Design a protein around this motif. Structure first.
Motif, PDB file in Angstrom:
ATOM      1  N   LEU A   1       0.849  -1.184   0.000  1.00 56.91           N
ATOM      2  CA  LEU A   1       0.000   0.000   0.000  1.00 56.91           C
ATOM      3  C   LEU A   1       0.882   1.229   0.000  1.00 56.91           C
ATOM      4  N   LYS A   2       0.822   1.984  -1.084  1.00 52.87           N
ATOM      5  CA  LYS A   2       1.628   3.184  -1.184  1.00 52.87           C
ATOM      6  C   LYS A   2       0.823   4.364  -0.648  1.00 52.87           C
ATOM      7  N   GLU A   3      -0.473   4.380  -0.963  1.00 45.00           N
ATOM      8  CA  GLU A   3      -1.374   5.425  -0.527  1.00 45.00           C
ATOM      9  C   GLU A   3      -2.811   4.945  -0.480  1.00 45.00           C
ATOM     10  N   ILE A   4      -3.521   5.260   0.587  1.00 42.07           N
ATOM     11  CA  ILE A   4      -4.985   5.158   0.538  1.00 42.07           C
ATOM     12  C   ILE A   4      -5.582   6.578   0.535  1.00 42.07           C
ATOM     13  N   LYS A   5      -6.429   6.852  -0.451  1.00 43.88           N
ATOM     14  CA  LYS A   5      -6.922   8.216  -0.680  1.00 43.88           C
ATOM     15  C   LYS A   5      -8.241   8.578   0.028  1.00 43.88           C
ATOM     16  N   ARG A   6      -8.509   9.890   0.049  1.00 44.57           N
ATOM     17  CA  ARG A   6      -9.774  10.491   0.480  1.00 44.57           C
ATOM     18  C   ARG A   6     -10.949   9.681  -0.012  1.00 44.57           C
ATOM     19  N   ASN A   7     -11.045   9.543  -1.331  1.00 47.53           N
ATOM     20  CA  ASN A   7     -12.197   8.926  -1.954  1.00 47.53           C
ATOM     21  C   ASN A   7     -12.194   7.389  -1.839  1.00 47.53           C
ATOM     22  N   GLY A   8     -11.159   6.834  -1.203  1.00 50.72           N
ATOM     23  CA  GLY A   8     -11.061   5.379  -1.031  1.00 50.72           C
ATOM     24  C   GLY A   8     -10.169   4.625  -2.023  1.00 50.72           C
TER      25      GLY A   8
ATOM     26  N   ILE B   1      -7.057   3.190  -3.927  1.00 53.80           N
ATOM     27  CA  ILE B   1      -5.800   2.782  -3.301  1.00 53.80           C
ATOM     28  C   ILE B   1      -4.737   2.774  -4.330  1.00 53.80           C
ATOM     29  N   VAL B   2      -3.568   3.268  -3.924  1.00 50.01           N
ATOM     30  CA  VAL B   2      -2.364   3.231  -4.754  1.00 50.01           C
ATOM     31  C   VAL B   2      -1.405   2.122  -4.274  1.00 50.01           C
ATOM     32  N   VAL B   3      -1.197   1.176  -5.162  1.00 54.51           N
ATOM     33  CA  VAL B   3      -0.480  -0.051  -4.926  1.00 54.51           C
ATOM     34  C   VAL B   3       0.816  -0.037  -5.825  1.00 54.51           C
ATOM     35  N   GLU B   4       1.855  -0.811  -5.483  1.00 56.92           N
ATOM     36  CA  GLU B   4       3.047  -0.942  -6.330  1.00 56.92           C
ATOM     37  C   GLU B   4       3.771  -2.251  -6.084  1.00 56.92           C
ATOM     38  N   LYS B   5       4.791  -2.517  -6.909  1.00 56.67           N
ATOM     39  CA  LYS B   5       5.524  -3.753  -6.812  1.00 56.67           C
ATOM     40  C   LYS B   5       6.776  -3.480  -6.069  1.00 56.67           C
ATOM     41  N   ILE B   6       7.189  -4.453  -5.278  1.00 57.92           N
ATOM     42  CA  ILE B   6       8.393  -4.332  -4.539  1.00 57.92           C
ATOM     43  C   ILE B   6       9.205  -5.599  -4.818  1.00 57.92           C
ATOM     44  N   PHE B   7      10.523  -5.462  -4.852  1.00 59.29           N
ATOM     45  CA  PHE B   7      11.419  -6.602  -5.041  1.00 59.29           C
ATOM     46  C   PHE B   7      11.779  -7.307  -3.730  1.00 59.29           C
ATOM     47  N   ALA B   8      11.076  -8.394  -3.424  1.00 59.24           N
ATOM     48  CA  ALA B   8      11.219  -9.032  -2.117  1.00 59.24           C
ATOM     49  C   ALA B   8      10.405 -10.296  -2.162  1.00 59.24           C
ATOM     50  N   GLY B   9      10.631 -11.194  -1.219  1.00 55.45           N
ATOM     51  CA  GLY B   9       9.794 -12.378  -1.086  1.00 55.45           C
ATOM     52  C   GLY B   9       8.410 -12.077  -0.549  1.00 55.45           C
TER      53      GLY B   9
END
Length: 203
Positions: free
Chosen positions: A97-104, A106-114
């Motif tokens: 979860l990179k950001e959860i916004k006012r209007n609901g 959600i901003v998601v992204e990929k991470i290099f990890a298990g």
């Protein structure tokens, strides 16, 4: 153990394929501690949101593992160990979860990890499949759930998890010092979701 801004920036430099999604029908947020064998004694925190549906494609391939609730009862993409209690016959994905916004949104992204290891996502997951029906509580849950599905077992790195929750303007919730609102058990956590904030006493 200790919070490392240097580790944070070097690992997070590799984060990629950010995407914005519509509001989840429901979800729960939990904290994750990031470590790497060649940075001994360092760590930093992030948040994950666990939402309904199967979105393995939104995850770095190293997180595309499916873990299951006990017996027949559902599964979560992105987590690395099986969950010792029943789900609600739904499929979920645990997303950075990179950001959860006012209007609901959600901003998601990929991470290099298990995938997400360990038992500290269990408070969240238990609330998600037993108590949350609609929306995402604006709070971050941390803790292992005992056999009784009521006792909350505390985590190491509560300070790291706090930092991670606060970054996004959210309180840390758990059954130990270091958290913003303490919940002695799962049913007090569920009462907190209902009240939304800690009740206040004035004499």
């Amino acid at each position: 153990g200790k919070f490392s801004r240097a580790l944070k920036n070097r690992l997070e430099s590799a984060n990629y394929e950010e995407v914005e999604l519509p509001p989840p029908s429901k979800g729960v947020i939990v904290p994750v501690v990031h470590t790497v064998k060649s940075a001994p004694g360092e760590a930093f925190g992030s948040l994950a949101i666990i939402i309904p549906g199967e979105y393995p494609e939104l995850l770095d391939a190293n997180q595309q593992v499916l873990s299951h609730f006990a017996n027949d009862t559902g599964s979560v993409w992105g987590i690395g160990e099986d969950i010792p209690f029943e789900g609600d016959n739904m499929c979920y994905t645990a997303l950075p979860l990179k950001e959860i916004k006012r209007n609901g949104n959600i901003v998601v992204e990929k991470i290099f990890a298990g995938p997400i290891m360990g038992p500290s996502a269990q408070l969240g997951l238990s609330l998600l499949v037993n108590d949350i029906e609609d929306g995402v509580p604006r709070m971050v849950f941390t803790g292992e759930i005992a056999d009784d599905e009521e006792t909350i077992i505390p985590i190491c790195g509560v300070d790291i998890a706090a930092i991670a929750a606060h970054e996004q303007g959210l309180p840390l919730i758990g059954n130990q010092p270091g958290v913003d609102e303490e919940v002695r058990n799962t049913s007090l956590a569920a009462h907190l979701i209902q009240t939304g904030t800690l009740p206040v006493q004035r004499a």
